Design a protein around this ligand. Structure first.
Ligand SMILES: OC[C@H]1O[C@H](O[C@H]2[C@H](O)[C@@H](O)[C@@H](O)O[C@@H]2CO)[C@H](O)[C@@H](O)[C@@H]1O
Ligand SMILES: [Zn+2]
Length: 366
């Protein structure tokens, strides 16, 4: 079971878990309460597994879309922030972590994907998806490829799929699923054509794409704020801008609010509330993590009005506006699992675009 008199936190491997472990150090120095940060694999799936038996971390971090499912399963404790405290964050951030009338988590940062490009290789990144193939051809003269990004996680391909009309649950309505409509078919087909014509490889994942771009072999990649620090290290002269358009329509990334929830079975809920409100959700707490791995547009009114002036952050916000905040309903997990399978199947050749999205639609509704 969950150890008392201590705090165990789970945050994803691509986040600043050191910047966090640091915030924990202060907490410990100030309370004698040790704080352990971990980033297990598939934690979004492992958490509900162990929390269901009363185990798991005291605090779990993840985009808000997975929390509705957790709250539904009674795995999250209700959080008690002062009306004053919840006045420090934007009303839209709180709505993200609100399920059936209850606030089930603490909003941390707003995440949206952006087009990241190499300024030296491409002083002027493309505005449309359509011109990328030609650009890839011309970049051969420099021994480079045009674009590389994670094709294994639907989160990354969804912006293109939803550009021409694809959608999950229309503004949260589970009876309205659009993963297999015309827009979705157009988007995915473009991606598969890019692969068939050798402009991209279906096997490209997060690691390969990040190395390819950071090692300066590819002129562009698609990723969130957490990827910037590593690029900074690479010394690549990069820029962050708006995602390309498809069929004239802007890419629509699914926007996620990194959030921290408290395990319903935790005997340390008091220590967790303290840590999160007075040690993390401050202007300095977020900074400590932001410096490790950028968070993006934070939920904290005070800090976001500070940032947002950052070019990269402003671009993040721009893309977020053209996209959509993610549902938080329990059904989101089935949606992702279905689209994940469909994108990999269509991209690998296992299935045609039509068959892939059809099956995805079925996995979701039937
Ligand atoms: O790909 C499906 C996946 O998308 C989102 O996960 C994001 C996460 O929100 C980001 O913070 C970052 O870590 O990249 C992840 C993609 O690998 C959804 O939040 C998640 O539920 C979904 O399974
Ligand atoms: Zn071509």
């Amino acid at each position: 079971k969950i150890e008392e008199g201590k705090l165990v936190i789970w945050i994803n491997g691509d986040k600043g878990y050191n910047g966090l472990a640091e915030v924990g150090k202060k907490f410990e120095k100030d309370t004698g309460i040790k704080v352990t940060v971990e980033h297990p694999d598939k934690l979004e799936e492992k958490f509900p597994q162990v929390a269901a038996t009363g185990d798991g971390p005291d605090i779990i971090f993840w985009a808000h879309d997975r929390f509705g499912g957790y709250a539904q399963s009674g795995l999250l404790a209700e959080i008690t922030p002062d009306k004053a405290f919840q006045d420090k964050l934007y009303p839209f951030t709180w709505d993200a972590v609100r399920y059936n009338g209850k606030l089930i988590a603490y909003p941390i940062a707003v995440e949206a994907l952006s087009l990241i490009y190499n300024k030296d290789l491409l002083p002027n990144p493309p505005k449309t998806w359509e011109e990328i193939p030609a650009l890839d051809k011309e970049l051969k003269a420099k021994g480079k490829s045009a674009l590389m990004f994670n094709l294994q996680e639907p989160y990354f391909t969804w912006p293109l799929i939803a550009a021409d009309g694809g959608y999950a649950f229309k503004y949260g309505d589970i009876k309205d699923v659009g993963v297999d409509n015309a827009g979705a078919k157009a988007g995915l087909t473009f991606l598969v054509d890019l692969i068939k014509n050798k402009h991209m490889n279906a096997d490209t994942d997060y690691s390969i794409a990040e190395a390819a771009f950071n090692k300066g072999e590819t002129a562009m990649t698609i990723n969130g704020p957490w990827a910037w620090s590593n690029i900074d290290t690479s010394k690549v002269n990069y820029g962050v801008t708006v995602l390309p358009t498809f069929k004239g329509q802007p890419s629509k990334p699914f926007v996620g609010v990194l959030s921290a929830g408290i395990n319903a079975a935790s005997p340390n809920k008091e220590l967790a509330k303290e840590f999160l409100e007075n040690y993390l959700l401050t202007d300095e707490g977020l900074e400590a993590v932001n410096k490790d791995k950028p968070l993006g547009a934070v939920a904290l009114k005070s800090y976001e009005e500070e940032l947002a002036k950052d070019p990269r952050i402003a671009a993040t916000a721009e893309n977020a506006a053209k996209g959509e905040i993610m549902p938080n309903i329990p059904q989101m997990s089935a949606f992702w699992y279905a689209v994940r399978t469909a994108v990999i199947n269509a991209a690998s050749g296992r299935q045609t675009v039509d068959e892939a999205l059809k099956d995805a639609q079925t996995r979701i509704t039937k």
